[PDB]
A paper describes a structure:
A quinol-dependent nitric oxide reductase ([name]) plays a critical role in the survival of the bacterium in the human host by combatting the host’s immune response. qNORs belong to the broader family of nitric oxide reductases (NORs). NORs are largely found as the essential component of anaerobic nitrate respiration, also known as denitrification, in the bacterial cytoplasmic membrane and catalyse the reduction of nitric oxide (NO) to nitrous oxide (N2O). Whilst cNORs are pre­dominantly found in denitrifying organisms as a respiratory enzyme, qNORs are also found in several pathogenic bacteria, including the Gram-negative, human-pathogenic bacterium N. meningitidis, as an enzyme that is responsible for the detoxification of NO produced by the host. High-resolution structure determination of [name] [name] (NmqNOR) is of importance to provide a framework for developing a knowledge-based strategy for the design of new antibacterial agents, as well as to help to understand the chemistry of NO reduction, 2NO + 2 H+ + 2e− → N2O + H2O, at the heme and nonheme iron (FeB) binuclear centre.
The best, highly diffracting crystals of NmqNOR only grew in the presence of zinc sulfate, which was used in the crystallization condition. Zn1 is positioned near TMII, close to the predicted entry to the water channel, and is ligated by His257, Glu573, Glu576 and His577 [Fig. 2(b)]. The presence of zinc totally abolished the NO-reductase activity for both enzymes, while the presence of other divalent cations, such as magnesium and calcium, did not significantly reduce the activity. The monomeric crystallographic structure of NmqNOR may result from disruption of the dimer interface owing to zinc binding near the dimer-stabilizing TMII region.
Numbering used by the authors: 2 to 250, 253 to 257, 273 to 306, 323 to 584, 591 to 748
Write the structure that this text describes.
């Protein structure tokens, strides 16, 4: 049409940004910490082969993987980071040993001058004994092997049942015998070791580790890289030079069968939401019987979110589809809508059940990757059920894309608003696919890549787009926006959302085995996602303090903007710069970001859809002004309560000790089980309840709208 300029602008951004994201992926595959063929102990005693690790990886998924504690910065925050906790002990044990044989004292009786003399040896041994090329085999010294075999007892007693370390496990919210088979434990530790190896050893090319010196370990000088600083100030420039430009100031002056089906869709979303916040409190109480332990209550807490939020978005789109098609279903829509609904119930019910058996070792650890627990945060489904939800999303696009070719028919009307909105829904449908391309014993580095195409590009990138696209469609069809307004703004917002979104992804991969390039791309581009925030919060305040148009959605789609500013913005870009994330990755800083960002934005959006559909599916069914009120505030103040008086304080405290002593310490057992940390953990269950309250209210309100 006449918008060809903006269309080319969009095609430009998509071409540019997808290449960066593609390239930085090829380099993930190439220059990722390889699994060694064998770990030989100078003498000969091979400690492990290739599959000694790859098994311990498979064995890690068995426990719930990232659902117990973090590994390489990614996971859960009650247990320690295993890659950090491993490296630290394996170093300390190495020292005590060499301080003995050289001076005959336990390093603490050895004088400052000598301590620092030992650590020089330590760093050279550890950091400069890199994977021998052309025959990828690694060679260790004997004082190290003795070091490992003196810490393995503790790890067997924590992942097991050794009665000594009972409260240890309890402090880590771990059900006694998290891995009952000492068969597998032996292998899990070969994985735990190799991770710690990838994080403590220089690349073939550099004087930093495969993990860009992650984590922060003073005893081998795992200090921020050099390129770290170069780019983590670049980005802070860009951001500020961003805000300066955008803001240079004020107070500106501008029913058919299928549709009727969506009632149970609405119910599902509120149902599942309240299923989730419960499981949330449950898994929150574990941080202060274990058929369903911490590892499980958390897994569902993560899983229900994606579902109920995604489902709310699907549901919305399904309602609009007939409305697009004049006002009539083309064929057996209602039929496909029922199929889809079954599907979604088979994925949700299916997975949850599968999860139960894997984390009790009832499922055979040969079906573990497909029907058990993937061990990978946000994708702990099982390759089968994940494909089933994939098929489901495909069907949703099928049903979706049908109603649209009927409106691509008339000769008169401008088919541009449609055009972009059509791409939008594809975005939702097709783009869960990336996270398919990784196997059981796929390199951790690679899985880490694709996972974030989903947990980042999908739920942030394409949902962002769909929200605005559907909004524009409605906003124009309601008649509060002209054609050449709603049509135009969608095409720009699509360009803006995607500019920071696409390459930004890489803010996840700064340390999980990438080239220092990751810090460059991620840091720069993710700084541009500032203009969407400012723009929204700007307009959202402008279109607010006014009387012109009048349980009103502005509430919903203002709160949205607000959290998109506190959570995606403040807490998001506080943690975005490589220099920062180098310390506060895997700390309660991320917990803040997540809660405020996921619920605060996409939670409300999702809830404001299923609510809107219910207001249309059962009209003249009168809302409750007191419920909606109570809810809208307990939820808001609730999130405010969670982040303020618990998560952030701890995050802060963690952040500090991470920086002063090392990360291993901010994750260490004694540090966690502390005076005010344990207390700040308690104060949470105050605002936890408040939150569940508003959650109940919104399910309750929603129910009595769809049912009667
Ligand atoms: C009272 C309500 C809630 C409570 C008590 C709660 C509690 C928790 C707990 C215990 C964790 C795990 C922390 C750890 O690993 O140690 C967590 C993480 C998480 N929660 Fe919630 N949660 C609540 C509401 C929500 C909501 C509304 C959402 C959004 C749908 C959500 C999404 C998440 C996500 C995505 C994570 C993973 C965070 C990360 O790995 O950094 N939670 N929450
Ligand atoms: C807009 C909606 C957003 C949502 C729903 C969201 C969601 C999340 C979630 C759930 C995590 C934790 C993942 C995990 O446990 O492994 C996370 C991490 C992160 N997000 Fe966001 N995010 C959003 C926007 C942003 C923005 C705008 C930035 C840019 C500053 C950003 C930067 C980050 C960074 C740097 C992390 C790293 C945390 C870590 O790996 O420990 N996010 N995000
Ligand atoms: Ca996490
Ligand atoms: Fe991200
Ligand atoms: Zn205790
Ligand atoms: Zn965004
Ligand atoms: Zn305006």
């Amino acid at each position: 049409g006449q918008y060809k300029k903006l269309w080319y602008l969009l095609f430009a951004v998509l071409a540019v940004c997808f290449t960066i994201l593609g390239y930085m992926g090829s380099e993930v595959y190439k220059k990722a910490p390889p699994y060694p063929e064998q770990v030989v102990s100078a003498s000969g005693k091979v400690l492990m082969a290739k599959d000694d690790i790859l098994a311990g990886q498979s064995a890690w998924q068995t426990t719930g993987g990232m659902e117990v504690g973090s590994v390489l910065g990614h996971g859960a925050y009650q247990a320690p980071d295993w890659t950090a906790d491993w490296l630290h002990r394996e170093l300390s044990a190495w020292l005590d040993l060499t301080a003995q044989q050289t001076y005959g004292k336990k390093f603490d009786e050895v004088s400052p001058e000598e301590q620092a003399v030992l650590k020089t040896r330590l760093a050279d041994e550890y950091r400069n004994q890199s994977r021998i090329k052309e025959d990828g085999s690694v060679v260790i010294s004997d004082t190290r092997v003795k070091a490992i075999e003196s810490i393995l007892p503790y790890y067997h007693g924590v992942y097991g049942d050794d009665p000594a370390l009972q409260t240890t496990r309890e402090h880590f919210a771990m059900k006694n015998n998290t891995l009952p088979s000492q068969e597998a434990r032996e292998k899990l530790f070969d994985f735990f070791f190799w991770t710690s190896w990838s994080a403590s050893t220089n690349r073939p090319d550099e004087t930093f580790t495969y993990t860009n010196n992650w984590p922060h370990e003073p005893l081998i000088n795992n200090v921020p890289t050099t390129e770290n600083y170069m780019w983590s100030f670049t980005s802070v420039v860009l951001l500020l030079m961003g805000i300066g430009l955008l803001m240079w100031g004020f107070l500106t002056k501008h029913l058919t069968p299928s549709q009727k089906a969506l009632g149970k869709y609405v119910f599902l979303t509120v149902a599942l939401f309240v299923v989730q916040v419960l499981l949330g409190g449950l898994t929150a109480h574990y941080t202060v019987s274990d058929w369903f332990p911490y590892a499980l209550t958390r897994t569902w807490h993560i899983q229900s979110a994606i579902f109920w939020i995604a489902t709310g978005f699907l549901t919305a789109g399904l309602f609009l589809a007939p409305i697009v098609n004049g006002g009539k279903d083309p064929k057996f829509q209602r039929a496909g809508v029922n199929f889809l609904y079954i599907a979604l119930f088979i994925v949700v019910g299916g997975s949850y059940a599968g999860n139960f058996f894997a984390l009790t070792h009832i499922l055979p650890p040969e079906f573990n990757f497909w029907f058990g627990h993937q061990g990978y945060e946000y994708l702990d489904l099982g390759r089968f059920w994940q494909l089933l939800l994939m098929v489901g999303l495909l069907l949703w696009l099928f049903l979706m894309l049908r109603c649209t070719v009927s409106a691509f028919k008339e000769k008169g009307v401008d088919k541009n608003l449609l055009a972009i909105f059509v791409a939008s829904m594809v975005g939702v449908g097709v783009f869960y696919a990336p996270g398919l391309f990784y196997g059981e014993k796929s390199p951790i580095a690679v899985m880490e890549y694709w996972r974030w195409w989903v947990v980042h590009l999908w739920v942030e990138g394409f949902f962002e787009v769909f929200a605005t696209a559907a909004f524009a469609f409605v906003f124009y069809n309601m008649g509060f926006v002209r054609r050449s307004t709603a049509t135009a703004s969608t095409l720009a917002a699509a360009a803006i959302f995607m500019l920071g979104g696409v390459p930004g992804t890489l803010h996840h991969l700064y340390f999980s085995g990438s080239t220092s390039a990751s810090m460059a791309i991620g840091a720069c581009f993710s700084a541009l996602e500032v203009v969407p925030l400012v723009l929204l919060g700007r307009e959202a305040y402008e279109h607010w303090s006014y009387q012109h148009l009048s349980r009103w959605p502005l509430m919903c789609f203002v709160a949205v903007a607000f959290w998109n500013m506190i959570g995606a913005g403040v807490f998001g870009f506080l943690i975005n710069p490589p220099i920062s994330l180098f310390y506060i990755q895997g700390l309660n800083t991320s917990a803040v970001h997540a809660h405020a960002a996921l619920f605060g934005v996409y939670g409300f959006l999702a809830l404001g859809f299923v609510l809107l559909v219910a207001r249309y599916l059962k009209p003249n069914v009168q809302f409750d002004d007191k419920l909606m009120t109570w809810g809208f505030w307990l939820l808001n103040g609730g999130l405010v309560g969670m982040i303020a008086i618990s998560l952030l304080p701890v995050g802060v405290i963690q952040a500090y000790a991470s920086i002063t002593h090392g990360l291993w310490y901010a994750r260490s057992e004694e540090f966690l089980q502390m005076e005010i940390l344990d207390t700040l953990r308690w104060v949470r269950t105050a605002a936890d309840l408040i939150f569940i309250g508003g959650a109940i209210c919104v399910a309750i309100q929603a129910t009595k709208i769809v049912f009667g």
